[PDB]
Ligand binder design. Sequence first.
Ligand code: MLC
Ligand code: MLC
Lengths: 935, 935
Amino acid sequence: PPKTPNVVEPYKGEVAICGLSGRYPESANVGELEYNLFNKIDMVTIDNRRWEPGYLGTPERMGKVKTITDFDAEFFGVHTKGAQTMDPMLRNLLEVVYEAIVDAGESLESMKGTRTGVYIGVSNNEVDTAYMKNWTDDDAYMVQGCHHSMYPNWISFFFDFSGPSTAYNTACSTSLVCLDAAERHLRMGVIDNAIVGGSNFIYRPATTKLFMGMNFLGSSTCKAFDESGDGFVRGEVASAILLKKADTAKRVYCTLVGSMLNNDGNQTNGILYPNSEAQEQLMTDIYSTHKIDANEVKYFECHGTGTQAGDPNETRAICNAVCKGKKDPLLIGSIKSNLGHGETASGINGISKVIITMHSRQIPPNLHFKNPNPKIPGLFDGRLKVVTETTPFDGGLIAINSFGMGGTNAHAIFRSFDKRAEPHPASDKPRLFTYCARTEEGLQKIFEEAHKHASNVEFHALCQESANTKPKSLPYRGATILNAEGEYTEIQKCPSKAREVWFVYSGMGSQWVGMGRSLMALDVFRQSIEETAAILSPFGVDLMSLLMDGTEDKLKEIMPPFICINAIQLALTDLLNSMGIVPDGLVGHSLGEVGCAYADGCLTRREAILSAFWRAKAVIDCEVKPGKMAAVELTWEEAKRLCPPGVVAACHNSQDSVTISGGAQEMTKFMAELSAQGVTVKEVNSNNISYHSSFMTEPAAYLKKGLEKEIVPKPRSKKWISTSIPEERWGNPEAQTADASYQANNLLSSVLFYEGLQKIPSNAIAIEIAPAGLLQSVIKKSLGQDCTIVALQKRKSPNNLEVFFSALGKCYSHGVPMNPLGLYPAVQFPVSIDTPMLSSMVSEAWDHSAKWRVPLVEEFEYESMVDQVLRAVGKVLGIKDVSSVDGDKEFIDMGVDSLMSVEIKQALERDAGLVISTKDTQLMTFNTLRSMVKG
Amino acid sequence: PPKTPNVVEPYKGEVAICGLSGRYPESANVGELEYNLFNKIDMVTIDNRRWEPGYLGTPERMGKVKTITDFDAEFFGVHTKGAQTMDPMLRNLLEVVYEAIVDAGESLESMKGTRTGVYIGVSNNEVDTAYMKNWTDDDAYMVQGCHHSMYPNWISFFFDFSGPSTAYNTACSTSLVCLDAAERHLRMGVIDNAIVGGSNFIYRPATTKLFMGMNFLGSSTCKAFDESGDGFVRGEVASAILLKKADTAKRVYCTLVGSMLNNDGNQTNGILYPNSEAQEQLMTDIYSTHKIDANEVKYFECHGTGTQAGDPNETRAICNAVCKGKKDPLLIGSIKSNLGHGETASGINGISKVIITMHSRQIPPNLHFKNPNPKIPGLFDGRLKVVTETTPFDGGLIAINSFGMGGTNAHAIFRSFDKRAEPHPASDKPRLFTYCARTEEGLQKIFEEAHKHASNVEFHALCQESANTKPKSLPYRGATILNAEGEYTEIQKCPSKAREVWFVYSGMGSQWVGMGRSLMALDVFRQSIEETAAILSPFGVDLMSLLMDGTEDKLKEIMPPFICINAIQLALTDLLNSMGIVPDGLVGHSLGEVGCAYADGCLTRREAILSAFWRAKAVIDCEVKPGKMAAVELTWEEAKRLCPPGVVAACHNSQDSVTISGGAQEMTKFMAELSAQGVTVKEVNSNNISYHSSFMTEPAAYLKKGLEKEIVPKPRSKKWISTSIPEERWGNPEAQTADASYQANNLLSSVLFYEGLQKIPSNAIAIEIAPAGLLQSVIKKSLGQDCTIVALQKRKSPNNLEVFFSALGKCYSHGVPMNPLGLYPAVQFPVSIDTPMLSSMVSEAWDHSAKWRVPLVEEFEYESMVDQVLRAVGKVLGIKDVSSVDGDKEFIDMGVDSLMSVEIKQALERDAGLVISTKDTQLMTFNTLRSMVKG
Ligand SMILES: CC(C)(COP(=O)(O)OP(=O)(O)OC[C@H]1O[C@@H](n2cnc3c(N)ncnc32)[C@H](O)[C@@H]1OP(=O)(O)O)[C@@H](O)C(=O)NCCC(=O)NCCSC(=O)CC(=O)O
Ligand SMILES: CC(C)(COP(=O)(O)OP(=O)(O)OC[C@H]1O[C@@H](n2cnc3c(N)ncnc32)[C@H](O)[C@@H]1OP(=O)(O)O)[C@@H](O)C(=O)NCCC(=O)NCCSC(=O)CC(=O)O
């Protein structure tokens, strides 16, 4: 019950900006914004997206995002009623925050429960005048979807953050005040991360008239640093960034040297007048507190509103504070000439441009700077130089200003991160890129981008850091092979419920020439084979020779097959363990029970390899009379009844396949008799040995004496399903350890494989670990129809590495977590600054089928009971089609909130006899409610 | 040009809340709130202040402030157009911020230019829809008066703060979020003060309907900790507080131990559900980081919303975090059962109640707690105990919570300030309380309150710290005598222009028995007399005896009169200097030239007293023939022409008063001749000595020889107007130092009093420093009609101390700064916690004649050229009556915010030939523009 206090201690390390995302005018994501900036593309257009070009006399040109009617409500657990009565700014900001989190190499599970603070800056409540003009019942949810205090809070609620979540409103410099607050809270010890951001969308056509009446707005696009500048043009943004401590960041765009804020005071030129002295003092203070040499600034992201009273004062302050001592012109610029003035999102726009500049390492061109302003002497003395074309920013410090209306100025400094990429051993060999998304098209675009960056391993690591999200959040799971000879790509929708992973190990018969030869490309496989060959060398076996240059005649013998099959199984187990696949169950077929022991932790590499060696040695050295085996189609009981003395049933493969083994003459007589009637009999290459029969009495004992001094007894976990001891005898002491006794019993007694395959669930993902998919048909027939089956190798395949990668991609697509990068040396974090951005992929990989309400200009001017209860409950939540939604998703995952729980309880009482408490309602699924109503 | 960087260094000292003010439901100020809380008065009433009791079905009862239609626009420099288009919340908050600043012992001049940050918390933006339903031109000013980012900024702009000014919106826990930001910024070193505050007024009934639709509101008043609680009732607050470093605070209500914030995260009970674990963890973290023993908390200001889901969880968290180890019940309470739920101003309500509990040292009662909630086990186990009646809180720590909707919790701890008052030497003697205000009634109420606290000197010091504000801000200047035998009270409206304080020193004839006897009550006067008597004792003069037990016969001699008059003049000069009155000019009548030198710094106490002693000794010892003097009504030229040899004109008193002096026989003949015709001749008691005549040739030389070895030569400042050397000879070397030559010349040559009184301005404030108002009539006639005249003493007065205090009160009322507390030992700051609050006085002392626009319910549903130019300019600003406003107040002082300057310039060009730049327009007065148009 007692709660451990948190260690709130001041932080003295570096603060790194890790992820960036946002919607910008004529740019659906950061990549489009970068492309438009670097191609001198003006993002301020004229159309009727918001209102007619001239409605109420407002300026025709504006900066508008592509769309604000799109949102993935189901992903964020917000119901239709709540989503409809929610600000489009909040929806776009939630999407952008998720995209930024993914961009920084973080995920939903990694950021859940962390001490992260949210510092959204928003100031536009026009969606409370349009939605209230015709207020009707069911619009109360606006309280939780439209209040400006709900912007960060929702981010805290969805991502499960537990840090200060506050909303700021500092006019046109709020985004940098949020950054300052995040720096203040990070350097004291309250939080380790920050979600500083900001959104601003234009809805009311009368606010532009308000801004025009004060002479704020100009005629044309913002003419930053231009003599003809007469105002700014409004813009829209939905941007967000993620800040983390530099020591724990997996990607570092840059470092936050420091940010500071100040005010102008009682100036005689009016409240809406910039104070050059205040800005100059703020700059001097920020550059002196951190001891930053102001002459080191390479680029200066100015607050270029384009007015005749703002640009001269800002330039004068910059010249007095940062150009004192500079021996070369200081490159100034702004993003307001490209996409206009974002109002409460100007600071976030400047931050985005600074990050783009320090990521692409090139300064975006500045538009509309034709004639220098005569009132800006710095442009004629050589102190200032507007960057009118792409300039190669190599490295250093970049300063950003944000002068909000009213005199509340803000400054910040960012230090570029110089960790240029170095080649990885990978990026030239095939790799398995696994990911997840909300839509098939989104995942296809993600795979296309991954192929575009097939030569980058840091990008693959950043993608993988968030590629293991649960199917509930990202139901579309997919996998593709980069740097592959043959194209491969799989995408499947995986239900919320997680299926169980079962490792199925094959026995004898998987031998062939070249087994595992291709898989030598992987370092881990070769290392495992070498560490097994070193073990087996002192016993007169050169595993490497038999595996690489071995021939069919060599594999005809008894030893090399056993040795090679065990080596392949152990190496594949090592590959899977390195890749991070934990098996929920383990089953094997005699000779694959040593591999099962190894994978279960009950045995070791030495123990397993030597157990197989001892088995083969005991079989060969003893003069066992020649025998034969074969898989007949007779049923288990039929085989047991029909087998005469001398021939018995070795293994119970499946429902209609049983292995008969016995002496050569009696076996041949059985073959003739069975072929006489209608029965399918298939002979198996057992090297003329009848395993699991009375003939194995003498070998088994020998094996025991062979392995008593080598196999240490260890416990057997319940995951590993025995296939040598009957189910009813699992509780006996002999079925507790995989000692020499267990090996002898397995080598002697029958193989009950059908029972072990029965114990498997009805939808388990069973992976056949073996040199070849020997028991594919047997396993598929035994399991059923709902069980996914994959083989890690294919016989005589031209390339087995691709087969292995495709098999594991199929396994991932069906919902098994794994780490494909575990087969290669780990990437050192933070990654190089050359790693592409992952935000664009997520931005274009959303589920946006539904269109939600947006403010309009016209609003600113003035039968089975079970199915019955199912439909009633679904309607209460707000789902038109109850059957459409998943049956394993809890109610809380949709957005059920207090009032809906009581309504559900009352509806159930009025409809059926159930009486359910409120708490249990939010954690019960549709399938569960159907089960209880049936009960 | 270079700017000195600020020393941004972390602060480790204490932070103290110094001021408090605000409007509360049914409470015009903090005093009314305290009275209502301590008398179990419910502040939630039912009436039609906002809307009908039941309009749209909203709850009838609400918490509403007295009025929101009142504002002193002229005081804050906001024009009529801006004030009309300004949120009433912002206006009330500006008034409350000024009241809080005054309460903490600060003033406008002291807080101007300081590094103070403003952290207003406001969420309500309902006045935007009402003002936009019928939008028309001239409403563009809402951008600078209605935007939420303009709430702190205006406070920064008016008070001239230069620190982070930000607006916060965290919902019901925004006030403690601003306190957290203020603590964060104060401790980093950016700021030295903070104006943390927040306002919330209800305007739209549809908002109440929206809240009701979410089940937020209940039926009756907030039943905090009551089993029948079912919701909260909306309230209104406009409170604000001032925080300062404890070392520089002049008043300390308490100390901010620390505040912290946290979030709830992804809770399964919905976003609008309190998280007990989150609140408990926040409490544990805050009490562990500061090492505060949670068992030391005496009172706990809980966030008692009164809901069935909020109170139980908050109480459980409090019990788990702060009641672990407590051996006595922990007294919990809330300010929501008294005045309801303030929404975005609940934390400020809690802070107000905490500062009231720790100021009055009594815990206010909690209302409506009839039956303990059965879900709160702490109330039955003895761990918790709601304070249902006034409880004597002695001292310790008080904790406040603020759980905002959405899950953003906040905690803060305050340590009481225990500095109980100790008696001052004053508080039983008469004192001069001087103050200023905006209205006569307000100043009368202020004086009534001061009389109520006549026994408190710390209260007087707190009032005096802000009693020297310029007449522009507070035109009504007043003064009253506390602890006075006779009631005195003066209140006058002083123009913006500052008048000159001229000292006038009288000469001979001010003698009388008991001169200065009453003024011995003042410590400084007695000390000065003692330090002069010690000087004059070695020369055979016992000043104390002549001044205390001296008789008429003693004063008939020559020495005692001169000695006593000089002693009184020097003691009054010391009294004035200690009080802090700097004279812009000094003039004196012969014998008052030594006092003028002393007050001007050209002489010392020793030098002046010995100069008078030497004058009297030279006059007496030499056998000067008997002479006589008298002030005739003749003019200067007439006296010069009509005087025969042997009788001359000594001093030019006024225009029609000249002093004739000469030998006894010739003087008597002159008396007979003048009385024969029509002329008024008044004889002056000069001890039968004819001063300023040829008879003084021998004495003067002696005086020179007497004073050559004593008086060191020092420069004479231009403030002192010589009345012994003609104007045309002021530049000569003799008129440079007050050496023995100057004394001899003054004692010999004539006195040019009238000429000295001509250099005095036409509206100067001349203070007659002397034992009696001898030259009252002469000076009044000489100066004119617009000059204020005051005498510090009255002859034969029953009490001179009261006369002196009344004289200085009259002087202050006309606009001369002074410090009446300089005559007593300085009060040690911070003051005792028993000092009453000054916020209430200022709150009820505003100029609220004009009524401004307020949101309405109906809006939520859908000829000389000089005078011509004067009227045009006044109309441009928005003044209906141009002549009404002061002619010496600059345009910037009335609210000009650019744009209007361009309009003024264009109007002047279109109306007259003037072409004035924009910058000069905001610093030019009406009288100045009239002068230029005339030119
Ligand atoms: C009957 C079987 C042998 C398989 O015969 P089938 O013809 O029906 O199988 P199938 O039709 O799917 O054949 C094609 C698939 O089998 C794979 N395959 C690999 N090697 C094969 C081989 N020698 N013969 C036939 N198929 C083989 C192919 O790669 C291909 O998979 P793909 O193309 O996808 O890659 C099986 O049921 C089985 O394993 N029975 C038990 C044998 C056994 O282990 N007994 C235990 C004692 S021997 C032992 O374990 C050692 C000891 O006891 O000491
Ligand atoms: C005529 C005056 C004396 C004042 O007579 P008036 O009666 O006309 O003035 P008034 O009616 O307006 O007010 C007179 C105020 O002074 C007081 N008062 C008047 N006559 C007084 C007297 N003989 N003795 C003591 N006090 C007297 C009154 O109580 C009253 O105090 P209240 O009004 O408070 O109730 C003055 O005008 C004057 O200065 N005369 C010339 C004195 C002079 O300058 N001598 C120069 C050198 S003598 C010198 O300095 C020494 C030296 O040369 O070494």
